[PDB]
Amino acid sequence: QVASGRAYIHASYNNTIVTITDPDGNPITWSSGGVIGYKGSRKGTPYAAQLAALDAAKKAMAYGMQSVDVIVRGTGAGREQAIRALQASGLQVKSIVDDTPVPHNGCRPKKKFR
């Protein structure tokens, strides 16, 4: 059982993941689109993150969680609405930070990013 923790939102074109970690970073519970019962582009939807982010939080606090610092990575249309319900969930949302990764012109991407 833990009261304060973390929350990472992997926001992608095709989906959105919500995994909650202990203060050290060890995951304690997680959730994303399909977990609530969606398959396909419907996953790439904010309302998914809601249930996703929500269903992850709900399960989280069941272990004693009450506070978590927020971490968001990616450029997903389901991103912000996920940040929403988390706040409007039942957790103190102690902070928000965007650690979205970005190279400095490193590896080449696939054909469809050029």
């Binding site: 902070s95 928000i96 930070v97 965007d98 650690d99 400095h104």
Partner: protein, 68 residues
């Protein structure tokens, strides 16, 4: 809110002037252009290289997390 006015004399080559140099890096650690720094051409260029060198010495960051 251009910055060059915010300061007076100061060495574009004092590649150790963190407290000053770190003033031109947006709160996301990025270098800030010229519509935002008030620096000119030759000026502007002489900066970064100064910043960069420090950003290699361990003084300035290559990037920073963002807080809302």
């Amino acid at each position: 809110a251009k910055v060059k006015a915010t300061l007076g004399e100061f060495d574009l080559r004092d590649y150790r002037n963190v407290e000053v140099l770190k003033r031109f890096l947006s709160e996301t650690g990025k270098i800030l252009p010229r519509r935002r720094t008030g620096l000119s051409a030759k000026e502007q260029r002489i900066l970064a290289k100064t910043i960069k060198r420090a950003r290699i010495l361990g003084l300035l960051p290559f990037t920073e997390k963002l807080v809302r």
